[PDB]
Design a protein around this ligand. Sequence first.
Ligand SMILES: [Zn+2]
Ligand SMILES: [Zn+2]
Length: 500
Amino acid sequence: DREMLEGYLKDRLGKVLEIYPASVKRKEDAIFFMVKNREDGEKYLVVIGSADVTEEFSGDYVGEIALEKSKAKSKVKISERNHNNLLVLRQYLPWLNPSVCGKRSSFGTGDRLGIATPAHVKAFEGKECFPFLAQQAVREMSRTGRNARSVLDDAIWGIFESGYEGAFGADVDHVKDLEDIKTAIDAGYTMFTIDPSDHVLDPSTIDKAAAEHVFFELNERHDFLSKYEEKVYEIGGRKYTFDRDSLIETVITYGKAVDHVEKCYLFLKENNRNPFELEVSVDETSTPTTPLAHIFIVEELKRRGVVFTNLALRFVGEWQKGIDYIGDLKELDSTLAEHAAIAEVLGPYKLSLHSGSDKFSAYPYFAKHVGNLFHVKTAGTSYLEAIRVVARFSPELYRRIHEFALQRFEKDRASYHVTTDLSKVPDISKIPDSQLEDLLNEPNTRQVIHITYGSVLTARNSDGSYLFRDELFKTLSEHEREHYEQVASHIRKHLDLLGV
Ligand SMILES: [Zn+2]
Ligand SMILES: [Zn+2]
């Protein structure tokens, strides 16, 4: 029984170590599982088996035990979740490795904290949907002190705690330059979201002379007019015609970005021996992606040999972080029908919705038009659920965090376009500890907390110690069950409304 192993461990190491039953796996002669120290919340891997297997793991030996199956004694060793031990574990447990998704529906669950992957796994139970359990943008990793190795390692450690053996993917989100691509390659990420948004031009903000010079140079090098001028596409009972000026606007908007994407794809082809997937994100545009722009981007990618699986368009309406969709559902439905039809005939390929966190108003139309071949990305919503749990069990922490975030909001709201109304966040000094949790139901407070995640995590006192991160993680460890169920139920709501 589990309690006998726990007593063995308590007697020899002198700590109360509780076993996660679902983590226990038996392969080779060996038995692997994860324990948690009741005193400090530290989690450890325990390996029981032949000396030849325990020797490949670093850590201190606990002793010898007798397996029920065989007379010969087995070595018991306890190891920390360092990187090389996770590598050895991932060789003994081959499912602990990211896979390429392919042309099937998927869902990304970013984890800005590194501890929510078991909950994300709970959310996919029974769902027919490929999970991206490792997903963090380069900028998120920068703002949190994590790197691609550590993000993937956190996700895989959580998967091991959960006991999940199905497939999963690892997405390096919004990548711009080639060195970050190299780090994600060396870590073994399986999806690369190429973000060429630096090169995207908005013709409504630049002068006409500059737009002209840009088109002239791009067309002198690529001959876009001979390729596309007057060309007609029949897709979905509709006609699309590349007239001169539409093609010119499209080229000035997207040509240099397509060049950037080509360069990144060629880099991945040269430096990645492992199976990989490529998503092309144009989710950073002030204007919704027109259908003609969609056609041009996809046709240029196909002409250049850039093999992509996902295309993340910028849809009509308002896609702000932490709140629901604001837009004309009529036009969203119609444009989604348009883009889905073009995706079918051009590829087919996956349409990828970034900023999907909490857009429940729009998920019906999404499941209608792309419900077969979609990808939906989320990240900050799990952080919001964690902060909700913090306000539920450590209100004095949430109060200080709320004030600090309100003061940091001005510097932090620059990198995002949020129409937050600060006068509509409730006055926290008039709210007792017993009710702070309700604050995370109010959209503008949700935006303030979503946006300032990095500042709260990185905040440091004068002496050099962090103000919140230590207590934040200790709080979340003390109420792991509640954190898990809140995150899992939220993500599963997202999956339910998407029809999977
Ligand atoms: Zn570039
Ligand atoms: Zn995004």
